[PDB]
Amino acid sequence: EVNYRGYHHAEWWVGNAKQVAQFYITRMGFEPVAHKGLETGSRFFASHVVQNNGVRFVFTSPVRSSARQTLKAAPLADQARLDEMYDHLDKHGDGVKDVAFEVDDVLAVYENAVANGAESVSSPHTDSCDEGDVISAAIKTYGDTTHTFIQRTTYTGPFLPGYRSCTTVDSANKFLPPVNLEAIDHCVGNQDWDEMSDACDFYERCLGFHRFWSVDDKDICTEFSALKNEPAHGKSQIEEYVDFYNGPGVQHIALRTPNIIEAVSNLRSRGVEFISVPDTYYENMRLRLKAAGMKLEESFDIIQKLNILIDFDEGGYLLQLFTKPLMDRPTVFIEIIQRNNFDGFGAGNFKSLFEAIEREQDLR
Amino acid sequence: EVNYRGYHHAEWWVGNAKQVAQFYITRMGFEPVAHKGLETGSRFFASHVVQNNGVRFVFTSPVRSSARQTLKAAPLADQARLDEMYDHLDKHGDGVKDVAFEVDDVLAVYENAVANGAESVSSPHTDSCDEGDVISAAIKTYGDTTHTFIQRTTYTGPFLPGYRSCTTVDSANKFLPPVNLEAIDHCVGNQDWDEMSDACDFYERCLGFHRFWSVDDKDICTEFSALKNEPAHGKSQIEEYVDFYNGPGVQHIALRTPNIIEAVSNLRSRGVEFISVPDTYYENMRLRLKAAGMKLEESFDIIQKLNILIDFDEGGYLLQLFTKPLMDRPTVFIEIIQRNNFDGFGAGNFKSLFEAIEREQDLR
Numbered sequence: 141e142v143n144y145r146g147y148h149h150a151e152w153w154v155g156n157a158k159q160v161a162q163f164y165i166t167r168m169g170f171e172p173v174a175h176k177g178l179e180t181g182s183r184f185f186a187s188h189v190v191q192n193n194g195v196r197f198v199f200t201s202p203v204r205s206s207a208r209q210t211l212k213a214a215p216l217a218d219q220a221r222l223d224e225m226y227d228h229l230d231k232h233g234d235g236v237k238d239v240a241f242e243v244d245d246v247l248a249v250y251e252n253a254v255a256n257g258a259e260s261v262s263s264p265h266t267d268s269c270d271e272g273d274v275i276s277a278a279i280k281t282y283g284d285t286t287h288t289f290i291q292r293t294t295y296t297g298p299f300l301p302g303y304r305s306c307t308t309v310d311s312a313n314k315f316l317p318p319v320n321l322e323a324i325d326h327c328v329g330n331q332d333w334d335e336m337s338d339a340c341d342f343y344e345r346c347l348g349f350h351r352f353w354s355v356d357d358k359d360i361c362t363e364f365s366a367l368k369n370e371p372a373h374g375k376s377q378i379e380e381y382v383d384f385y386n387g388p389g390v391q392h393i394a395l396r397t398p399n400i401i402e403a404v405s406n407l408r409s410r411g412v413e414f415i416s417v418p419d420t421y422y423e424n425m426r427l428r429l430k431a432a433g434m435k436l437e438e439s440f441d442i443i444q445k446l447n448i449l450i451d452f453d454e455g456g457y458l459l460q461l462f463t464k465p466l467m468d469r470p471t472v473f474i475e476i477i478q479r480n481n482f483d484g485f486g487a488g489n490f491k492s493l494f495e496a497i498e499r500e501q502d503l504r
Numbered sequence: 505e506v507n508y509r510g511y512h513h514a515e516w517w518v519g520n521a522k523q524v525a526q527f528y529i530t531r532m533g534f535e536p537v538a539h540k541g542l543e544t545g546s547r548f549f550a551s552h553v554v555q556n557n558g559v560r561f562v563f564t565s566p567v568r569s570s571a572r573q574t575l576k577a578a579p580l581a582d583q584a585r586l587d588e589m590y591d592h593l594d595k596h597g598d599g600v601k602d603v604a605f606e607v608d609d610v611l612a613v614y615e616n617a618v619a620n621g622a623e624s625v626s627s628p629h630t631d632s633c634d635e636g637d638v639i640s641a642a643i644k645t646y647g648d649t650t651h652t653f654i655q656r657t658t659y660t661g662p663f664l665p666g667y668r669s670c671t672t673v674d675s676a677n678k679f680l681p682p683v684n685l686e687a688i689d690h691c692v693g694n695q696d697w698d699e700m701s702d703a704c705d706f707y708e709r710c711l712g713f714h715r716f717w718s719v720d721d722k723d724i725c726t727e728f729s730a731l732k733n734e735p736a737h738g739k740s741q742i743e744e745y746v747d748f749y750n751g752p753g754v755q756h757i758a759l760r761t762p763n764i765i766e767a768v769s770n771l772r773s774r775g776v777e778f779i780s781v782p783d784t785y786y787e788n789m790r791l792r793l794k795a796a797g798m799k800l801e802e803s804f805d806i807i808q809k810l811n812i813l814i815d816f817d818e819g820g821y822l823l824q825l826f827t828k829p830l831m832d833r834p835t836v837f838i839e840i841i842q843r844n845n846f847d848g849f850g851a852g853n854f855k856s857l858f859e860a861i862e863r864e865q866d867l868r
């Protein structure tokens with residue numbers, strides 16, 4: 141019954157994979173699924189994959205230091221990998237690193253990608269455990285985040301080669317209200333203009349008759365190309381959406397739910413914390429929705445209490461919400477979105493939210 | 505009613521303070537208490553303090569990278585601090601960094617410490633917010649972990665200068681069975697022999713007529729000085745206590761509970777995971793306890809199910825248990841201990857547990 145929307149998973153690079161992974165277990169309803177580490181011969185990195193219906197996260201941490209003087213000298217390729225991982229956690233901190241797509245024909249989707257100028261990160265190769273085989277490749281897309289192409293061949297195991305399945309459920313979830321998340325809706329690994337642009341232009345040059353590997357990126361780039369804020373050291377009436385819009389190296393990963401009220405509630409009660417949109421947003425939005433005769437399913441007054449956002453067109457609307465920044469840097473957010481016939485991505489909420497500080501800064 | 509046993513707190517250095525701190529909120533029953541960061545002018549580090557009755561943890565993360573090229577050039581003292589924090593997370597990873605003691609007369613306890621050869625880390629100084637003042641100092645003790653001496657003067661605020669109080673309770677705890685932890689029982693920031701020794705000899709030279717700042721370290725060094733394992737690539741019948749005993753740079757922090765059964769249960773059900781001691785341990789222990797006429801309060805059979813450990817003497821016993829390593833390095837553990845008239849620290853369980861693999865390796 142589960143539904144990946146073609147996303148194999150998203151892999152994070154984080155300092156404490158083992159413990160950070162549990163954040164999503166306790167706060168957001170995930171379940172431990174697979175593991176890769178010193179128990180399956182991974183001498184240099186541990187990986188913890190937690191899943192929520194279609195949503196699958198991988199958290200990956202080095203298990204050892206750079207010049208680890210006690211046991212082995214690291215092979216040259218591997219010390220470079222460890223070195224790379226620390227330099228990313230320094231520059232960026234905990235965050236999404238790689239979006240990986242279930243793909244038929246990695247060789248082909250990889251080939252076209254670099255023909256049109258993709259920065260290669262991992263030419264096609266074939267990780268091969270005892271449960272089978274898989275072909276992957278990877279390319280730089282949005283900043284230093286990446287896309288990975290995955291073609292299952294003979295592999296049958298839990299997840300990928302090297303991974304072992306997970307030995308049973310998590311107990312904290314028999315006490316916690318569940319979070320009905322469906323699948324990964326989209327992901328922008330870096331929201332700098334230059335960076336976004338660069339990645340979008342690259343995607344456009346990847347368009348052909350064969351369908352592009354990430355429909356959700358093609359529609360984001362399309363919707364936001366039709367147009368390309370202002371802060372205050374007050375807090376800002378936009379609160380942390382101003383950091384979302386104007387912060388550097390900001391990311392967000394969005395997670396589709398069939399019920400954003402149910403989702404947001406059970407996350408409010410598990411202890412997750414979202415940005416507060418001002419009252420003036422709903423003021424103006426209630427008129428816009430009414431004048432346009434767009435009648436929502438959900439009570440407008442509950443969408444207000446929950447600081448949930450709205451965008452729409454003639455055929456339907458979306459419901460959107462953002463967590464407070466997940467870490468001590470204001471750079472990583474998670475979006476929860478519910479669609480009722482709207483392929484949109486929230487372009488309207490830039491105008492609306494920017495207009496929200498507008499009436500407040502114009503107030504003086 | 506709360507009881508710190510003279511421990512102001514333990515401060516961890518971790519990669520993701522904001523999220524790691526919540527681990528202890530969800531998995532172990534802590535509550536958010538104070539915060540220090542970009543919201544109180546801390547341009548370089550964030551601190552999250554969570555408390556459980558007497559137990560108070562501080563988690564501290566850099567909010568910025570080393571050569572953060574976007575905003576400020578860091579002052580020389582501060583870039584050194586950021587640089588230091590990354591080098592510790594590289595060499596060691598997430599773990600306890602500093603044990604801090606509520607102390608009258610920092611100047612004096614600091615003075616004697618370095619007279620007898622303490623490695624100074626922070627001469628007496630006086631952090632001074634608008635709610636008052638505090639004197640601190642710090643010295644290297646066990647490896648690169650530290651002790652900090654804290655003398656409240658005019659400070660009245662939540663916690664320390666720069667900290668703001670915490671805006672209300674965590675919701676996940678109205679759904680989770682509580683964990684009745686009392687206070688910090690002890691802490692060994694590095695269990696290498698050389699390192700332990702060095703720190704103990706240093707403590708001994710700190711003994712005088714004035715009482716020593718950490719009674720729990722003086723008794724550890726005393727009990728374990730009366731004596732100073734063997735592993736298998738099988739897993740080991742000792743399971744992860746072999747990593748505890750023979751692993752390098754292992755730490756553990758112990759947390760006293762009045763009811764280790766209640767504590768361990770509610771932690772089993774919140775999702776915390778402990779090492780399994782073999783059956784042969786309880787086999788031999790039931791005879792030892794009986795021959796010695798030591799009658800326990802708690803059902804021996806529940807202490808067996810819960811992989812809880814036992815040490816005792818003529819006047820009473822202790823009950824001990826260890827988590828599985830908390831991170832992808834096998835280097836940080838947490839001990840839960842319950843005392844019934846026994847100042848011991850588990851020296852007996854070395855003999856018992858070492859003897860447990862003994863009958864198993866002797867089995868062949």
Ligand SMILES: CC(=O)C1=C(O)C=C2Oc3c(C(C)=O)c(O)c(C)c(O)c3[C@@]2(C)C1=O
Pocket residue numbers: 328331336340360361363364365367368475485486487489490
């Ligand atoms: C509202 C939100 O969820 C965000 C999203 O999910 C998809 C994003 O793509 C862009 C792009 C470029 C064109 O792709 C852009 O230029 C701006 C100014 C922008 O604001 C966004 C985004 C970040 C959007 O704001």
Ligand SMILES: CC(=O)C1=C(O)C=C2Oc3c(C(C)=O)c(O)c(C)c(O)c3[C@@]2(C)C1=O
Pocket residue numbers: 692695700704724725727728729731732839849850851853854
């Ligand atoms: C059982 C446990 O809780 C541990 C504890 O809490 C206090 C520790 O101090 C030592 C010391 C030195 C003398 O202090 C030592 O040499 C050995 C071999 C030792 O094993 C321990 C410890 C680590 C003990 O094992």
Ligand SMILES: [Co+2]
Pocket residue numbers: 394460475477485486
């Ligand atoms: Co969005």
Ligand SMILES: [Co+2]
Pocket residue numbers: 758824839841849850
């Ligand atoms: Co102990």
